[model samples]
Target: MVDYSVWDHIEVSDDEDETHPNIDTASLFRWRHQARVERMEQFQKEKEELDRGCRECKRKVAECQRKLKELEVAEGGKAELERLQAEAQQLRKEERSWEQKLEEMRKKEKSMPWNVDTLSKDGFSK
Candidate 1:
């Protein structure tokens, strides 16, 4: 059994610590919870960055295709045609890393329970 005391909880508040009595504790709980959601949202933003990296890589692929097409047709980049292919490889690796992080956060949030389950009822039943 828990022993309750008013003095243990009620703090002597100054002007800075005082609050209105009508404030909803559940709403405050949810409001504070948003900071955690914001953190998870930040992790999701990494996925967006990963997607952007993927897009850049795709753009590079298209650019390379255009260059190759140009070489076949009329004009071409003759200086270092073999060099830009490496950029595609590096960008793909970074995109995979970010995507993995996003998957991890997704799994974590999916399995986590947001509230408590109480077992207490009346005294009559077992």
Candidate 2:
């Protein structure tokens, strides 16, 4: 067996030399925590946006269903049934598109080069 020798080199920064002029002595920790809090807030915001669109779609579908029942019960409802059904189908398609978009954004966030510094560096996420 052969033995190997090694020498280690490490870095240690002087606290006085490394300090930045902008560092808030009173609130440095809070500043760092704010980023995490903001990221979570944005996550909820996007989720709500996606859910709002889905809720609208659900409302349209409910209206369409109601119209369909009316069509079966009343003669006048027949003429409007076609339009209501069409509207429901359109809403469903748009809802699906929004859901897919939201999924895409989540995947992007998961797969991105996700250092905290990098996340806020690009497009303003919100």
Candidate 3:
């Protein structure tokens, strides 16, 4: 059997600092703050990496197209044209895969349980 009652009075805010007289309040708050900071840091890193990947794919595709345009007037550009076309196809496939990954991230973010951002301090004060 699972005890789901704990969720009934969940900790929705780090702003509350209630503790027992026997507890060391400073370290308890410090621990919670540390976890939040680390998680936010990791989330920021994930977004940066994904954004970098998306930008890199777009830049490569643009550069390939630019080269293809220049090759149109060059002698024996037929071979290079074929190569660029294949490269463009591969790049597009990668871009689509990244798009799917980003969509998954967005969906996961939305489906998460309510937290500090979602909770309102309506009934907690006077």
Q: Model 1, 66-95: lDDT tens per residue?
A: 765565555446524444455455457656
Q: How high is each candidate's TM-score?
A: 0.30, 0.42, 0.40
- Clashes (candidate 2): 0
Per-residue accuracy of model 2 over 1-126 as CA lDDT, tens digit each: 765433213333422362344555755775567546655655666677768766886787777767666665656556666766676666677767877987877656533443234344555555
Better of 1 and 2 by lDDT: 2
Model 3's TM-score against the true structure:
0.40
Candidate 1 residue pairs in clash (backbone atoms < 3 Å): none
For all candidates, the clash counts are: 0, 0, 0
> Which 10 successive residues of model 3 have the least lDDT summed?
109-118
Q: Identify the candidate with maximal TM-score.
A: 2
Question: How many angstroms is residue 79 displaced in model 2 relative to the true structure, after the best TM-score fit?
Answer: 6.4
Candidate 1 — which residues are off by over 4 angstroms?
1-39, 69-126
In candidate 2, where is summed lDDT lowest over 10 consecutive residues?
6-15
TM-score of 1: 0.30
RMSD of each: 19.0, 14.9, 14.2
